[PDB]
Symmetry: D2
Subunit: 293 residues, 4 copies
């Protein structure tokens, strides 16, 4: 089957003002590359090439200008806007026509993932053509997230969005895989107390059909978010330490495309020319002559 991608870069509102007055959070860099490269790279690693970027009226054109139609990176990028931040689950109504009768994956524009065998973690979720797949990650502050409770057998048995009394420390990450049933589930949602269409409700519909796979994203993986000024800074230092230690970049879309055989040497060479005088173009150039396992 075919699986298409959606990145939701919703508005942070005025939460991070005045820092984000001139530029929305999702267009900020994390260290050396725009924030959106990280979730984009995650979809690419999941085998996904057709991707819809949804954001605000104001930012959607800015992403188009940054990313184009993606043909440079062997992708097919399209855009849509969410006129008002009416909940993450609205992504599937906005993208109904984009999705068609195909499988889909949703990732939030401000989630970074790092770790080993990430291709294989995602592959098993991409492989499932029936039901939904999500990931649970042990966090210190589960109250801020969708929370998954497990029984002593290891079976997911409940989900709650931002519970006052969380039942575990397992938060659901901002990467979701879905089958063809997601649009209709999305269409029947009602607004929560806060007036949002909630992705946790989508996820609960599958759980209540026994069609939700909840895989553990283990403690050896880094799932970071960019919610506060503080965490933005930590995420930047984290990526800076890996990259400077390794001489290898995290979530460089041009590299991922090249390693997936979606662009060839000659194309990557052309992508490197414009930035040949900075570290990034110099890095793309080096990938043409080095074996990296």
């Amino acid at each position: 089957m075919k699986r298409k991608g959606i990145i939701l870069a919703g508005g942070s509102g005025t939460r991070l003002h005045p820092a984000t007055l001139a530029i929305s959070k999702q267009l900020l860099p994390v260290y050396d590359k725009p924030m959106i490269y990280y979730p984009l790279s995650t979809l690419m690693l999941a085998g996904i090439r057709e991707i819809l970027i949804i954001s605000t009226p104001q930012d959607t054109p800015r992403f188009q200008q940054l990313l184009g139609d993606g043909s440079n990176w062997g992708l097919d990028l399209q855009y849509a806007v969410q006129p008002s931040p009416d909940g993450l689950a609205q992504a599937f109504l906005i993208g109904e026509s984009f999705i068609g009768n195909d499988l889909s994956a949703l990732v939030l524009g401000d989630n970074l993932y790092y770790g080993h065998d990430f291709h294989e973690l995602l592959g098993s979720a991409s492989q499932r053509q029936t039901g939904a797949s999500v990931f649970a990650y042990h966090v210190l502050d589960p109250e801020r997230y969708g929370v998954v409770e497990f029984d002593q057998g290891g079976k997911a048995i409940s989900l709650e969005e931002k519970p006052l009394e969380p039942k575990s420390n397992y938060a659901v990450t901002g990467l979701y895989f879905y089958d063809q049933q997601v649009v209709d589930i999305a269409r029947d949602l009602k607004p929560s107390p806060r007036g949002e269409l909630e992705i946790t409700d989508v996820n609960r519909a599958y759980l209540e059909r026994g069609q939700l796979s909840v895989e553990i994203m283990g403690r050896g993986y880094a799932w970071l978010d960019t919610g506060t000024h503080d965490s933005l800074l930590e995420a930047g230092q984290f990526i800076a330490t890996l990259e400077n230690r390794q001489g290898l970049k995290v979530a460089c879309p041009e590299e991922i495309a090249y390693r997936q055989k979606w662009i060839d040497a000659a194309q990557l060479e052309k992508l490197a020319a414009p930035l040949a005088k900075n570290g990034y173009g110099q890095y793309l150039k080096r990938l043409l002559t080095e074996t990296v396992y």
Copy 2:
């Protein structure tokens, strides 16, 4: 005599791409506030209220939307563009009519200053009705900056822009105070071997007339630039550590305007309401009822 301020927020070119592809360096935040807030606050602490922000064709309108006419902070802000990055001293040609017959001060849009008695450090440059004043600061890498040589008695005796063999470790910082001669010195300037109208040629012109005052910005002050992704990050951590230690912000313009008796408590409360839900608005609110010495 009245002193007017100029902030040159010129381009970074393609130097920091792809990170700055969607947003220009000087519109990024440093931790919790826009970069430009820091040099703006520096001019405000120096007593300056009439300020011209010069940036690229693309960014000047964005600074204009972020900052407006300045009347909300008791400032008077105007705008002009630098069509091409033909050197820093071009700020005086672009700003000729804005400066008029008055004294002036230039600050770079990407310089952050911190330390004690900063009001007094600037005041003694601001008080000088004739001549020019600049600040020298000990750095690791003087070859990147304008460099000031001193003789055994502490007298400034030479300036070189980015010398290959620096004569000292003292860099001239991106904050400059000038009398009414500056525009005429700037109009006589011809381009250097790197094709720029050099602020260091302006400073040398004052030096060769015996009218340059070089004051030491002591090691107890922090002068950070934001030249690389690495230093941007260090800058962020540095401000974060001060702010979270003290519960006081560095370079909050609303606060400086309020402490300078330029806006009143009413106006401050009115600036605080729209941000009432985030830390920044709350901070502005707290300043209303706490005495800080």
Copy 3:
């Protein structure tokens, strides 16, 4: 003349297991042992005669690291605090070290940075009467001695770790005292938590109208190293300054040289054994470079 005391006590078990193998104040902040910072602070206050007080197990190690201090133009002595019975116990333990002189006490994990710091210390240190402390605006005053001011800015109360703090002004870990302090310490009774409190010593001066409270402004950095998190921030803060400037913060050898307590020959010989690393190279650079 003023005598100096560095209280490098226990952090108890609260930074365990990181401090299982080492006293907190022997850990480094970036490139140098933590105690170099308060030591440098007392030196900057013009104090050369310094008593270092620590645990029985730690005191020999400070002694190994620092010696008699004569290499840096200082006069260092050592004494032990057998149980962590409170900060104000430094004066009882140090009674005979102090004698009839004026004194100062700095906490071994307090780090300070900023401009004119010599002058901020000079005013307190030159006083020949009463006591002097510094008040610093912090986010978390509950963790500290908290000074309350009236509308004229006069200090009117002090409280140790108040549950409901009267201000955001913490009293920093640097204290200057006239000859009254030892006798005030002697008459103290243990607090609820069973500690001889420095805040009780400072309240005794305040009640006599003999406490001077100066503001350490927001342009100074008073870091402390109370948690693993803050220790790390302190490390990052020092590193950023030093790598920016090419100058070191709280380098006692530098401070001794600049104070004229050791000469260029002496400094050169201190550089020799460290000449293969950045620290010794730094000292050798100081011989030839004028730094304003």
Copy 4:
């Protein structure tokens, strides 16, 4: 059938003086725990319980006070001294009697590792009953390390210690596994030009026999090292960001013993007791009542 471990916690000479004038590098903390906890945890994760710790004359006794005989953690620890820093390969001479007739592993006392499936990465190598196993990791500065060269088929064809002209960017990490041949190979080593018994000469002897296995430690793992004050600080920040995000600790030996079933609940409870009023003891207590996947 036993694999025995060695942690070489040598002298960093005077390289990090004066910070290490009072204590050995490997007794410093990386964030919340002593540095040696990290490689210790690494040998524990590889299934190794009998471990010799080698440090200097001055430091060995201090490791003894910190760690004891290891019985509180289900381990069996011994201590020996390296009187002169005459090479890593010396660990096998000093450790000859400790190893006896068993298989062995050597880890450097300042090496930190983090990543997913690390148990499995270590498992394959520790399970081998022949030859030697080492890990190759892409770094920015291969000159500082042993460097492995591969042919176009990925086969290792040469090993060089600190080459002036590195043949690849793949460094051999400070984690080595050996069959019963290493002791005899070590004992026939002669000093290299810098007067050192080289672990790289040991690994080369196995390579020339066709008995060296080089596994790649992929980029999704973090091999941090702690060579400079700068890197030590970065390592601290890295651990801190992981631990505060997750509410789980990296390289907590008590946790590893418990999960390996080498100590029981009651024993973990007793270990928690004296640390109950810091975050580390509370964390041991929470591990009694939480299921962590």
